[PDB]
């Protein structure tokens, strides 16, 4: 009997200086395949390209 859910850091920290993103990044990451370090280097080099 529980409810798993994303919880943005902005709702717990008060100081806005140290919070940049939202739940959105977590969602988009959940969309990603598990990534090997070599794969990650590939994505990076591709974004550079």
């Amino acid at each position: 009997r529980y409810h798993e859910s994303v919880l943005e850091i902005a709702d717990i920290f008060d100081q806005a200086d140290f919070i940049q993103t939202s739940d959105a990044v977590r969602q988009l990451r959940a969309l990603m395949p598990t990534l090997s370090t070599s794969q990650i280097r590939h994505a990076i080099e591709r974004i550079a390209q």
Binding site: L35, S36, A43, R46
Partner: protein
């Protein structure tokens, strides 16, 4: 008159192929970012989304 549908797509003209996006089907599709390593990635791969 006769407009069967009016959709809201991402601007193909803005997210151009120079950005490596391909909005020809409804979703963004970028090849060669998240790919298998050591074998050629399949065409029309979902990962492209």
């Amino acid at each position: 008159y006769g407009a069967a549908v009016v959709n809201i797509d991402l601007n193909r003209d803005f997210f151009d192929t120079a950005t490596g996006i391909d909005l020809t089907k409804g979703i963004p599709l970028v090849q060669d970012l998240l790919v298998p390593i050591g074998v050629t990635a399949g065409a029309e791969q979902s990962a492209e989304y």
